[PDB]
Design a protein around this ligand. Structure first.
Ligand SMILES: *[C@@H]1O[C@H](CO)[C@@H](O[C@@H]2O[C@H](CO)[C@@H](O)[C@H](O)[C@H]2NC(C)=O)[C@H](O)[C@H]1NC(C)=O
Ligand SMILES: *[C@@H]1O[C@H](CO)[C@@H](O)[C@H](O)[C@H]1NC(C)=O
Ligand SMILES: *[C@@H]1O[C@H](CO)[C@@H](O)[C@H](O)[C@H]1NC(C)=O
Ligand SMILES: *[C@@H]1O[C@H](CO)[C@@H](O)[C@H](O)[C@H]1NC(C)=O
Ligand SMILES: *[C@@H]1O[C@H](CO)[C@@H](O)[C@H](O)[C@H]1NC(C)=O
Ligand SMILES: *[C@@H]1O[C@H](CO)[C@@H](O)[C@H](O)[C@H]1NC(C)=O
Ligand SMILES: *[C@@H]1O[C@H](CO)[C@@H](O)[C@H](O)[C@H]1NC(C)=O
Ligand SMILES: *[C@@H]1O[C@H](CO)[C@@H](O)[C@H](O)[C@H]1NC(C)=O
Lengths: 366, 346, 224, 50, 198, 50
């Protein structure tokens, strides 16, 4: 760490030591239910742009590997999560949405966009955590002479916000007069149809879109995945998987009176300090296992190759990554004498070290 | 605002004014010497035992080596400042057991063995006046091995890679140095700062001190009891003013407070996103694929590295200011205490 | 009805997140009730639907549980899906669809593909009953606090915190609301929420003891 | 600009410490001038004769 | 006329605060110090001001050097005329040459050019497509304008941090010079100094 | 190239800041040395341990 073959007399800081965890704690939920994707990916007719059936999905183990056997999407186009990590990362509530739009309208089902579907139909939010599945659909829902069952508002007065379903068959008109259905000059086409035909260009062909919103919250432990849960250990440095948060540390007895709705333990530095057990309700505490700095005390290499090691700021019983306890840590390799000399190598709060003849050895004194 | 009272001194061609009496007044001056020594680990602060973050941090070169070098230089400089101010005497002088120094009461500045850390009355008042911060320069992890009571501030500071080193000289050694300086100054005079300590009675030493400022030494010997009473009343007035008012040690209080709030801001900088999608590294690592999580981790690494460089630069500037004040305090200890000074307002 | 006017008197706060903290001072960008605002003392004796602008403070001092239920909806004329909240004795009945007898329902206590239904514990629990309602991201949050008091003339002073009880994931579009007046006088307090930047004080437990309205006066701006 | 402010809010508390540093410099300048010039308890006046 | 530098510096978000003590109060403090050191000598800095004739003060100040007081009183017209010529030389040296006050000129110039550079830093693109923010908001969609805004924020934050660090170092240098000036006011004006070249 | 430019600019700015702080320390030491040359060499000093 000094990039040299000869070190001089003094005290040097070299690295840091950290104790490694033994095993892991996995306490995933236990839901003995599964959800069928067959009733959401190949229904006979899906929806219009505003008739999108909100299939709210909760309390079922979801297998995310068999989705590729369904209708041919090119890629599992997600925003925020990668489509191989859903088997272990788990969410709180999944909403299923489905609508049929044009070819040059799929780009508005991205988080943050403007256009016609992004303004007059179901607009995805800018902070959207989920997956959108879309494909070309001139095989099933492409009945000729205009498929008028999938019919859309071309013009709308106001912005249609996310989760603001508008099933109104009413009229929008503006500018001079009340209209009451006079289609020519004033009371134009209220809610027209797409006219899905196979004679259209590929930029305007019908496209079926399936939207799954894998949202994230600090809510109580609802719907999760197929990860195999394990048992519990305590009072030692192990990894944990308490609900969704993970890390390492030592779990001790608590004396903080949590309110019955409060669960998590976020700190000043936005780390978790005291979190609730998901199954056997005991609201314990989190503290990380032992670490600190390590420093090497040596004379010159032209004198000797002996060293003394100072583990800074630990009680000297949790040492592994002569024994003397110091206010600045604990010292290994130096014998404490009941004498007093001038300070040669400074260590800590009044303790120094030197290389004296009292057999040559490294001694520590006040 | 008012600059002061208007005064018009009666100057004339042959008029002079000469004092006929005197007052002995003892003032107080407070000077900082050293601040808190800190050391910061880069890997636990920026990354927090993540291998992927360490691999992306290895490409940034050697910023952390020079950050550690700057912090170690500041930490050595603090011990040098304390040793330069206090450790000026060669031998630890001791006061004789008979406490008679011509009628002057030194019982509030001389130590007493009633308490384990042998400090005087005024030193005890000064140590109790500064409300210290957390400042975990002791074996702090023994208290945080078991999470008890509520969340502390030094403990969350420690858990993110920030470590406070203890000072080289303890408080009782500084009190021993101060007691040696008092025992030299009362007994020997200015002779112990120029060679061997030569004893002299305190009345004859104070006669030398009056002879140094242009007053004839017979004024002391004819007014010894009055001067001793004035000195005792001034010492009691300083003791009462320190016991009553708690707003005189503001420089040392600011020395504590600045190093508290710099570490608090360095801890609070970990909660920011810096343009990424999460402030927690594990959520970024578990949610996304390789390339996007590398982009988010690069954003977090740049933000945390910028905050750490800002902290190190602020510590270097404060260390320069503290070193200037420590040099001033060393000069004042060398000139006011170990001798008599002719520099006015010094 | 009768529109008597009074003041807020330093109340209307709630826990913003379900995260415990203690002995810390925290600042939240949220939609709290402003301090010393203009609330209305409604006496229901003679009632169109009041608007739902970003949240309702809704409160009642009724001992005998005259105020029971609530209705929500955009048009509320059997044209939109709307919402229905029924506190049926020791149960809660929530319907996302509507029946719509007339403009004020007056259910006689003497549906086109409904989506969500709900049942739970009774909704209600020297009495100051407080429900803060809001609708953010399609979620209908409910706050509650049982407040024993000693003043029965207006809103009493002091400080108390409102705890969340029941969370709903549905509601879509709500811009009108109306209390229930089913007969088998009355008084209900209503206030309007606005976005604020409150700073909260936590005790040794997770109890909000004091708070400051950060745009009320320059002294509170200095405290922020 | 509102969008720039919302993006700047994600960068932490650099603005607060920059403002604190410049406030410290601004107070220190007045401390320097006061400790250099204000060295008299009273404002003396020269006699009318010169 | 035209747009001033100070107007643009004000408009960009930078404010210059006035000092607490106006120039009239500084002149009053200086005149009080001069009146004290003319009438009373060094006695106004050690307690109460004690009056003394100026020839007696000059005799004491010769006697502190190592020259006896009979040298003054037998030569008082010569010291008076030499001092009059020496103080009349100062206005001749200062009314024509303008290079003596270069330290105060540098104190003004550095704090002008730092604000000039920090204002000039606002026209740089920092890798974005335009330095004007409203063009970015009116020209692009949400995500791309957010990318350009992040680039501009990083550049302007770096410029502000560099300015603050340079001001901190210059404040340390100015404080060291102010401490030296306070020591010189204490020791040269309020008394007599035996230190060589001080 | 923009990434490399940002990294090298940051390293150069860090070097300039450290050189400025070192220059301030060296200037303080040089002022002390000039004072000692003016007082110890050019005269006799009454200050203790100066
Ligand atoms: C010089 O001053 C001291 C006090 O500053 C004077 O001592 C006081 O004398 C009066 C009576 O003369 C007593 O009532 C006080 O108690 C004394 N004070 C102290 C502290 O001893 C002293 O008399 C003065 N001498 C002259 C010549 O004026
Ligand atoms: C999961 O375990 C808890 C208790 O350990 C039990 O109450 C619950 O019914 C279990 N869930 C299922 C789906 O069996
Ligand atoms: C989905 O259902 C339709 C009709 O029920 C069927 O033709 C189609 O093959 C199904 N999809 C798959 C992938 O089998
Ligand atoms: C921590 O160190 C102290 C000091 O020796 C000791 O008394 C105490 O037992 C230690 N705690 C342990 C070993 O848990
Ligand atoms: C000295 O002062 C006195 C009193 O003001 C005055 O009468 C006298 O003329 C002065 N001496 C001279 C030479 O002016
Ligand atoms: C003054 O000295 C006497 C000893 O003669 C001592 O008893 C007394 O306590 C001293 N005064 C103070 C304030 O300590
Ligand atoms: C509330 O509004 C009414 C409207 O006229 C007004 O008279 C009353 O003073 C207001 N109350 C306040 C501001 O406390
Ligand atoms: C915190 O909760 C405990 C246990 O209920 C209680 O004894 C204590 O008084 C509470 N402290 C408060 C409310 O400040």
């Amino acid at each position: 760490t000094l990039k040299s073959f000869t070190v001089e007399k003094g005290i040097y800081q070299t690295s840091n030591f950290r104790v490694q965890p033994t095993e892991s704690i996995v306490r995933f939920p236990n839901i003995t239910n599964l959800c069928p994707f067959h009733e959401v990916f190949n229904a006979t007719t899906f929806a219009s742009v505003y008739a999108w059936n909100r299939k709210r999905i909760s309390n079922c183990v979801a297998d995310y590997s068999v989705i590729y056997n369904f209708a041919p999407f090119f890629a599992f186009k997600c925003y925020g999560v990668s489509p191989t990590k859903l088997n272990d990362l788990c969410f709180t509530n999944v909403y299923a949405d489905s609508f049929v739009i044009r070819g040059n309208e799929v780009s508005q089902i991205a988080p943050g966009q403007t256009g016609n579907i992004a303004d007059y139909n179901y607009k995805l939010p800018d902070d959207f955590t989920g997956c959108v599945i879309a494909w070309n659909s001139n095989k099933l829902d492409s009945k000729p002479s205009g498929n008028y069952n999938y019919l859309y508002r071309l013009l709308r007065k106001s912005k249609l916000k996310p989760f603001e379903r508008d099933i109104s068959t009413e009229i929008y008109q503006a500018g001079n007069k009340p209209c009451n259905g006079v289609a020519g000059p004033n009371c134009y086409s209220p809610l027209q149809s797409y006219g899905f035909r196979p004679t259209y260009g590929v930029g305007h062909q019908p496209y079926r879109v399936v939207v799954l919103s894998f949202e994230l919250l600090h809510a109580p432990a609802t719907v999760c995945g197929p990860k195999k849960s394990t048992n519990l250990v305590k009072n030692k440095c192990v990894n944990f998987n308490f609900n969704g948060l993970t890390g390492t540390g030592v779990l001790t007895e608590s004396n903080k009176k949590f309110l019955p709705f409060q669960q998590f333990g976020r700190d000043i530095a936005d780390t978790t300090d005291a979190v609730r057990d998901p199954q056997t309700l005991e609201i314990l505490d989190i503290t990380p296992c032992s670490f600190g700095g390590v420093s090497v005390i040596t004379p010159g290499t032209n004198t000797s190759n002996q060293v003394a090691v100072l583990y800074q700021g630990v009680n000297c019983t949790e040492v592994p990554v002569n024994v003397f306890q110091t206010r600045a840590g604990c010292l290994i390799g130096a014998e404490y004498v009941n004498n007093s000399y001038e300070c040669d190598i400074p260590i800590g709060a009044g303790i120094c070290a030197s290389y004296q003849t009292q057999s040559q050895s490294i001694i520590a004194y006040t | 605002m008012s600059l002061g009272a208007e005064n018009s001194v009666a100057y004339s061609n042959n008029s002079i004014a000469i004092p006929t009496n005197f007052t002995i007044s003892v003032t107080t001056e407070i000077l900082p010497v050293s601040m808190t020594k800190t050391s910061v680990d880069c890997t636990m602060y920026i990354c927090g035992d993540s291998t992927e973050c360490s691999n992306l941090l290895l490409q940034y070169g050697s910023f952390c080596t020079q950050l550690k070098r700057a912090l170690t230089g500041i930490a050595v400089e603090q011990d040098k400042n304390t040793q330069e101010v206090f450790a000026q005497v060669k031998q630890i002088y001791k006061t004789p057991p008979i406490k008679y120094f011509g009628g002057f009461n030194f019982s509030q500045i001389l130590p007493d063995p009633s308490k384990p850390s042998k400090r005087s009355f005024i030193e005890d008042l000064l140590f109790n006046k500064v409300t210290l911060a957390d400042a975990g320069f002791i074996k702090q992890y023994g208290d945080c091995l078991g999470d008890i009571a509520a969340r502390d501030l030094i403990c969350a500071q420690k858990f993110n890679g920030l470590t406070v080193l203890p000072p080289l000289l303890t408080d009782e050694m500084i009190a021993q140095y101060t007691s040696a300086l008092l025992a030299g100054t009362i007994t020997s005079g200015w002779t112990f700062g120029a060679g061997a300590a030569l004893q002299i009675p305190f009345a004859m030493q104070m006669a030398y001190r009056f002879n140094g400022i242009g007053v004839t030494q017979n004024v002391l010997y004819e007014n010894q009891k009055l001067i001793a009473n004035q000195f005792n009343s001034a010492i009691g007035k300083i003791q009462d003013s320190l016991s009553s008012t708690a707003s005189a040690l503001g420089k040392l209080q600011d020395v504590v407070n600045h190093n508290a709030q710099a570490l608090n801001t360095l801890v609070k900088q970990l909660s920011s996103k810096f343009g990424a999608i999460s402030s927690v590294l594990n959520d970024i690592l578990s949610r996304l694929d390789k390339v996007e999580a590398e982009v988010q981790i690069d954003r977090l690494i740049t933000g945390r590295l910028q905050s750490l460089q800002t902290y190190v630069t602020q510590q270097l500037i404060r260390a320069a200011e503290i070193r200037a004040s420590a040099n001033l305090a060393a000069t004042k200890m060398s000139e006011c205490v170990l001798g008599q000074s002719k520099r006015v307002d010094f | 009805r009768t529109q008597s006017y009074t003041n807020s008197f330093t109340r209307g706060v709630y826990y913003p997140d379900k995260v415990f903290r203690s002995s810390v001072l925290h600042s939240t960008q949220d939609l709290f009730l402003p301090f010393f605002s203009n609330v209305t003392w409604f006496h229901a004796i003679h009632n169109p639907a009041l608007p739902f602008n970003d949240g309702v403070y809704f409160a009642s001092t009724e001992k005998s549980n005259i105020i029971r239920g609530w209705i929500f909806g955009t048009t509320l004329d059997s044209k939109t899906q709307s919402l229905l909240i029924v506190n049926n004795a020791t149960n809660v009945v929530i319907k996302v669809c509507e029946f719509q007898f007339c403009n004020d329902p007056f259910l006689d206590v003497y549906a086109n593909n409904c989506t969500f239904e709900y049942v739970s514990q009774p909704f209600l629990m020297k009495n100051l009953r407080e429900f803060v309602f809001k609708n953010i991201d399609g979620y209908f949050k409910i706050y509650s606090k049982h407040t024993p008091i000693n003043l029965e003339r207006d809103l009493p002073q002091g400080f108390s915190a409102l705890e969340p009880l029941v969370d709903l994931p549905i509601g879509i579009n709500i811009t009108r609301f109306q209390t229930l007046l089913a007969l088998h006088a009355a008084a209900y307090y209503v206030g309007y929420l606005q976005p604020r930047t409150f700073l909260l004080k936590y005790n040794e437990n997770g109890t909000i003891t004091d708070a400051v309205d950060c745009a009320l006066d320059p002294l509170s701006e200095t405290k922020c």
